[PDB]
From a paper:
We found that adjuvanted protein or mRNA-LNP immunization of rhesus macaques with ApexGT6, an Env trimer engineered to bind Apex bnAb precursors, consistently induced Apex bnAb-related precursors with long HCDR3s bearing bnAb-like sequence motifs. Cryo-electron microscopy revealed that elicited Apex bnAb-related HCDR3s possessed structures combining elements of several prototype Apex bnAbs. The primary hurdle to eliciting Apex bnAbs is believed to be the low frequency of bnAb-precursor B cells possessing a long (≥ 24 amino acid [aa]) and acidic HCDR3 that can penetrate the glycan shield and bind to the positively charged surface within the Apex epitopic region. We designed a slightly improved germline-targeting trimer, ApexGT6, with affinity for additional PCT64- and PG9-class precursors, and we evaluated B cell responses to this trimer delivered as an adjuvanted soluble protein or mRNA-encoded membrane-anchored protein in RMs.
We also determined crystal structures of unliganded RM018 and RM038, whereas RM017 did not crystallize. Beyond the HCDR3s, RM018 also exhibited extensive glycan interactions with the heavy chain framework regions (FR) 2 and 3, as well as CDR2s, similar to CH04 but with the heavy chain and light chain positions reversed. Our finding that RM018 had a binding mode sharing features with CH01–04 bnAbs prompted us to revisit the idea of targeting this class of Apex bnAbs.
Residue numbers in the entry:
A (entry chain H): 2 to 52, 52A, 53 to 82, 82A, 82B, 82C, 83 to 100, 100A, ...
B (entry chain L): 3 to 9, 11 to 27, 27A, 27B, 27C, 28 to 95, 95A, 96 to 210
């Protein structure tokens, strides 16, 4: 019925991350759960899986030694811990449950494993695990002075996200808030601009409110010609 | 392996198919090839399983086939909602699961709209920080494919350029931004800088000068 995945987690290189996949609506133990990872803007990747009832794990050689898939049927939750995290390990982590059970009572109430079923049918919302050494940092707001266009540059901040609002939420017409760009320094940079009448440049004051919960920073900036 | 075409495009109402090439033990080895549909920022969805089965709720448009080491996903009566990445999957010897690269299916449901490009020079407040970042902003264009080239004194410069991938706007257009990070000396060492954005062969140039 559902696979409740954890929140969002960020880790430093060399650290460990343990993801949890809590299921509801079906008998947890018999159905098999596999973990599929998808790096940002990349194809899906298979990591492993486990049959909770018998606790049998099947990993991918690409993750042998580091990945450790487990499951506590007491709480119908499966955990996939990845150790020795890497900057390259940043990706969205999914857990999927098969179409049908992987272990079946067969009469004689003894167990009998079904055969190589489909195994990816019910997916979880996914969890993002950004593995980087960049620490939390507040943005440095710089004005982009100016049919006239002006905006705010939110540079060298980490991690996501930053919320930008003009005139403390007043000006909400013709405003683009572009996606951030992760530079080679590991800090995201984002831009936000508005389109305003040329006559109002010298009469209407434009202020961009930048908020960053991760660094507990809120900035108000004024853009003038 | 599970090699797939990089992307596929077609008109609405026209059939479209995908290819999924593999080895003897990947696809032809077992009849457990399945196709997934993933929209941006969402979990993938299973469209076909066991080669040609279609799980409950999947529109009868999607149909899976298999001939040797290659599988195929066919979407007849292509619609706008069918715009997403499609992956194939299949079991393999040694109890393993292999994935394909993924095909980007685009439905040409909108007219061609040239990009709107604005260029901002390094702000003097930023220059006081020993950083000269040129910001090039691209917005309101379709389809979401553009190429950005930075020119300094009409000479190309590929050093220190990062451009975000295009996204979906509220008006179903696409947006992207390109940043040219220069040192304060470099920004002042050239008379002018240019941000050329090419979209569907049409190119738009915007330039700035230290002034």
């Amino acid at each position: 019925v559902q696979l409740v995945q954890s929140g969002a987690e960020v880790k430093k290189p060399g650290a460990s991350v343990k993801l949890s996949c809590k299921a509801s609506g079906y008998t947890f133990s018999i159905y098999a759960i596999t973990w599929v990872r998808q790096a940002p803007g990349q194809g899906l990747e298979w990591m492993g899986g486990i049959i909770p009832l018998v606790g049998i794990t099947n990993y991918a050689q690409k993750f042998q030694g580091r990945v450790t898939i487990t499951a506590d049927t007491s709480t119908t939750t499966a955990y996939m811990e990845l150790s020795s995290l890497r900057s390259e390990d940043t990706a969205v982590y999914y857990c999927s449950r098969g179409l049908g059970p992987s272990i079946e009572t067969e009469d004689d109430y003894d167990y009998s494993y079904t055969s190589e079923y489909n195994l990816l049918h019910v997916w979880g919302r996914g969890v993002l695990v950004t593995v980087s050494s960049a620490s939390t940092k507040g943005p440095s707001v710089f004005p982009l002075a100016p049919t006239a266009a002006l905006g705010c540059l939110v540079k060298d901040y980490f991690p996501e996200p930053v919320t930008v609002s003009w005139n403390s939420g007043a000006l909400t017409s013709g405003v683009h808030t572009f996606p951030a760009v992760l530079q080679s320094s590991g800090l995201y940079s984002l831009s936000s601009v508005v389109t305003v009448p040329s006559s109002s440049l010298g009469t209407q004051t434009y202020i961009c409110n930048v908020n960053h919960k991760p660094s507990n920073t809120k900035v108000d900036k004024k853009v003038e010609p | 392996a599970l090699t797939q075409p990089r992307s596929v495009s077609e008109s609405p109402g026209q059939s479209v198919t995908f290819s999924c090439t593999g080895t003897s033990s990947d696809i032809g080895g077992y009849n457990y090839v399945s196709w997934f549909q993933q929209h941006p920022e969402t979990a993938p969805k299973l469209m076909i399983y066991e080669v040609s089965k279609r799980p409950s709720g999947v529109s009868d448009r999607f149909s899976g086939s298999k001939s040797g080491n290659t599988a195929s996903l066919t979407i007849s009566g292509l619609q706008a909602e069918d715009e997403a990445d499609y992956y194939c999957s299949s079991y393999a010897d040694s109890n393993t699961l292999v994935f394909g690269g993924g095909t980007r299916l685009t439905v040409l449901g909108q007219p061609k709209a040239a990009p709107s490009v604005t260029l901002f020079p390094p702000s003097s407040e930023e220059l006081q920080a020993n950083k000269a970042t040129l910001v090039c902003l691209i917005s309101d264009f379709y389809p979401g494919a553009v190429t950005v080239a930075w020119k300094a004194d009409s000479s190309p410069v590929k050093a220190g350029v990062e451009t975000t991938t295009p996204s979906k706007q509220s008006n179903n257009k696409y947006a992207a931004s390109s940043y040219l990070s220069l040192t304060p000396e470099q920004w002042k060492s050239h008379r002018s800088y240019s941000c050329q954005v090419t979209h569907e062969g049409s190119t738009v140039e915007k330039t700035v000068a230290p002034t």
